[PDB]
Structure 1
Amino acid sequence: ANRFTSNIKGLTQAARNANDGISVAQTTEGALSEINNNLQRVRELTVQAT
């Protein structure tokens, strides 16, 4: 039972740690999406300029 309790607490903490990676990836992906929009507008401008 002591080993089982240790495992249960460890796995719960592991899931909590896992959620952090999801948060980081979401924020980073939003930033990259904004960069992508800027790049798209830059490409449109180059097409207009050439």
Structure 2
Amino acid sequence: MRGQIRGLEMASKNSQDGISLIQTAEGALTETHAILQRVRELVVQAGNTGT
């Protein structure tokens, strides 16, 4: 059992490391996303003002 808790605790560390990783990528993707919103504005602007 104490084996199970040692592996548990290290797996909770691995879980937390998970959370910070996934949140790193996630926040980066929200930054990309903010770009993409400005980009879409630059599509209706690259709408050529129509022409």
Q: Give yes or no for TM over 0.5.
A: yes
TM-score by length of 1: 0.80
Give 2:10's aligned residue: 13
Please provide the CA RMSD for this pair: 1.0
TM-score by length of 2: 0.79
Which structure 2 residue ranges, 5 or more long, are not aligned? none
Percent identity, please.
55
- Count of aligned pairs between the two proteins: 47
Compare the two structures and name the one with the higher helix fraction: 1
Structure 1: 4+ residue segments shifted above 6 A: none
- 1:39 aligned residue (36, 48, 51): 36
Which structure 1 residue ranges, 5 or more long, are not aligned? none
